[PDB]
Amino acid sequence: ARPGKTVTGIAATLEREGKQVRLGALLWFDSTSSSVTDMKRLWLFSDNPG
DNA sequence: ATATATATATATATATATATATATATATATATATATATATATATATATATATATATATAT
């Protein structure tokens, strides 16, 4: 369904007594290439509601 | 008929440039440490004035 240039995003948000911590990630291709090493990755960690 | 060979597609490697993090190196400002002049303490010779005292005069 998404063979060409694309981006992907997942994010789990956990909270305790109103304090946020938002795990996450991004994964994008820049061209039709579909090999493992072509995957551009970027993992994110945060605690800011913004 | 089987297998051959070229054109095609796709997965991988190579070249090149940008930016960042790195290693080697220079120089800098900082701190430890040593050296010094100086003042103060410890000990001493020489001697005085002193307290304690023997030796002692004097007394009952």
For B10, which residue's CA is nearest its C1'?
Answer: A33
A32/A49 Cα distance (integer angstroms) = 35
Write the CA distances from A30 to A8, A11, A15, A40, integer angstroms: 12, 21, 34, 8
Could you give the 3-state DSSP secondary structure of residue A37?
helix
DSSP β-ladder status, A24-29 and A6-10: antiparallel
- Strand B interface, A 14-43, C-beta < 7 A: 33-35
Rg (CA), chain A: 14
| Resolution limit, Å | 3.6
Six token digits for residue A29:
């291709």
Question: Solved how?
Answer: cryo-EM
| Any strand B atom closer than 7 Å to A48 CB | no
